[PDB]
Structure 1
Amino acid sequence: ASKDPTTFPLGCSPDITTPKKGLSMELYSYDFRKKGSYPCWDAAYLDPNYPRTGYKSHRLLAKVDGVTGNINFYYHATKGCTPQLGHLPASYNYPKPLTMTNFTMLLYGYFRPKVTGFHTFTISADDLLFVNFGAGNAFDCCRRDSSADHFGNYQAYAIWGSKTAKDELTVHLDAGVYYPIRLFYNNREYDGALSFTFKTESNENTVSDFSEYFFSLDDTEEGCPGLIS
């Protein structure tokens, strides 16, 4: 698939193996600058290659499976320029404290729609959430191994304090097809927040609980390109 973001993204058709519930998550540290710097937070999170290669230089905290449910959070800090502990919601399947003021997080896997039609995803973040969506744009169907670092221009992005603090992505999707998805998050300092929800043209319900929507698929030899059309 093309890497470019599109309104009609390509999806994937898994084989016999049952998709596993939830997304994969990786957590990385994101240190402050040395005492007395102005500002105190590291600006690395906005380097253009930070979401591709830069984050990998940071200390790996965790890699977990099975992230699903409601993945939204709001972490309230009490002090600027200070690492403070907190916990992710239970949905993240990570039962240890981390520096919720300052960390990087990567989620990847597949989104399976329940209805065929236009979906509008709405995102917000403190500090940053970058979203790739579709085969190629995120990664290749059951070939994430060979394509994970080759994602394309973001389908949506949100940066706290910017002219784009919230964003939307509208895409036409087919029910029961599995669409590659990559979420890249950072908190630089202080409060952190992530909101990821959607609506469809089918009804006026907002979906915030991804239990029946987020899945993981094993990579395979020849891939699992979408077979529908």
Structure 2
Amino acid sequence: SKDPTTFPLGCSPDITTPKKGLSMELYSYDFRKKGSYPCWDAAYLDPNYPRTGYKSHRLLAKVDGVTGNINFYYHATKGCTPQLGHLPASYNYPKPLTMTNFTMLLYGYFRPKVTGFHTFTISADDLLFVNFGAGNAFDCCRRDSSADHFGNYQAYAIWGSKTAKDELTVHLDAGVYYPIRLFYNNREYDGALSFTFKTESNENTVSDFSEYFFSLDDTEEGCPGLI
């Protein structure tokens, strides 16, 4: 089912070794033409922007192995102006980009260490939309066939809105691989992404996803959760 749920379905990959990290695609996000009021494009809030609209902009990069702490804060000096910066080393992308104005998609799997409830907390400047679970994000080792068919967001944050931070609480089983999709945009000026979680079992905040994000190969058979 594509609908978001407190009890998401996960995946059981075969022997082939999971690879560390998420995959990432970077895209352009231009300003409006000189003198427009305001200067930033509102396309990022088109209902279909996270599904199809982004693909009409320019592909910048496709990277594998994104893991570790994926949080960032980029400080711009000027409005209405493309300015260069770098993502943190965790993104495995060693080129500058226009950090003031870009779109980023990350996808893969989250593998828990604890069976029980997890609460992920997110915030972003400007936008972070999260899908989580088989079907809601994509299907088990069948990402290519289902990548565009994700469901209602499990959580979302939009800078400047009444929902500028959000939480998602899900019950998960240790060692199972859960499809995840993170879609981020910066429209102008500063950018920021925060993505962390806690489990109901203790007070520790987890922000380093070294032990938790993996990529699995698609297969003809699929790898549906057997638990």
Query: Do these two structures clear the TM 0.5 threshold for a shared fold by scoring above it?
Result: yes
Shift of 1:202: 1.5
Question: Counterparts of 2:144 and 2:96 in 1: how far apart (Å)?
Answer: 29
Q: Secondary structure, in 3 states, of the residue corresponding to 1:56?
A: helix
Give the SS at the match of 1:147. helix
1:152 CA drift (Å): 0.1
Secondary structure of the corresponding residue to residue 55 of structure 2? helix
Q: For residues 194-229 of structure 1, what are the alpha-carbon distances to aligned partners after superposition, in whole Å with 9 as ceiling and x for unaligned?
A: 00000001211000000000000000011000000x
Superposed CA offset, 1:60-95 (max 9, x none): 000000000000000000000000000000000000
Distance, in Å, in 2 between the alignment partners of 1:16 and 1:113 is 18
What SS does the corresponding residue of 1:106 show, helix, strand or coil?
strand
Q: State the alpha-carbon separation in 1 of the partners of residues 45 and 131 from structure 2.
A: 17
- The structural deviation recorded for 1:137 is 0.1
Task: Using the TM superposition, give the Cα deviation of residue 185 of structure 1 relative to its aligned residue in structure 2, in angstroms.
Answer: 0.1
Runs of 4+ in 1 over 6 A off after TM superposition: none
Return the alpha-carbon distance in structure 2 between the equivalents of residues 169 and 159 of structure 1: 15
**CA distances 1:27-74 after superposition (whole Å, capped 9, x unpaired):** 000000000000100000000000000000100000000000000000
Residue 23 (structure 1) aligns with: 22
1:145 alignment partner, SS class: helix
* Whole-angstrom CA distance in 2 between matches of 1:37 and 1:47: 18
Unaligned runs of 5+ in 2: none
Matched residue, 1:44: 43
What SS is found at the alignment partner of 2:25? strand
Unaligned runs of 5+ in 1: none
Distance (Å, rounded) in 1 between the aligned partners of 2:104 and 2:194 = 14
CA distance in 1, matches of 2:58, 2:116: 41
2:129 matched residue in structure 1: 130
C-alpha distance after superposition, 1:79-135 (max 9, x if no partner):
000000000000000000000000000000000000000000000000000000000
Query: 3-state DSSP class of the match of 2:145?
Result: helix
Q: Distance in 1 between matches of 2:203 and 2:18?
A: 28
1:174: which partner in 2? 173
Question: How big is each residue's C-alpha offset from its partner over 1:175-195, in whole Å with a ceiling of 9 and x where there is no partner?
Answer: 000000000000000000000
Question: Distance between the aligned counterparts of 1:140 and 1:65, measured in 2?
Answer: 19
Aligned residues between the structures: 227
Task: Give, in whole Å, the separation in 2 of the partners of 1:138 and 1:45.
Answer: 19
TM-score (norm 1): 0.99
Q: Distance in 2 between matches of 1:38 and 1:134?
A: 40
- Secondary structure in structure 1 of the residue aligned to 2:148: coil
**Aligned counterparts of 2:119 and 2:17: Cα–Cα separation in 1:** 27
Q: CA RMSD in A?
A: 0.3
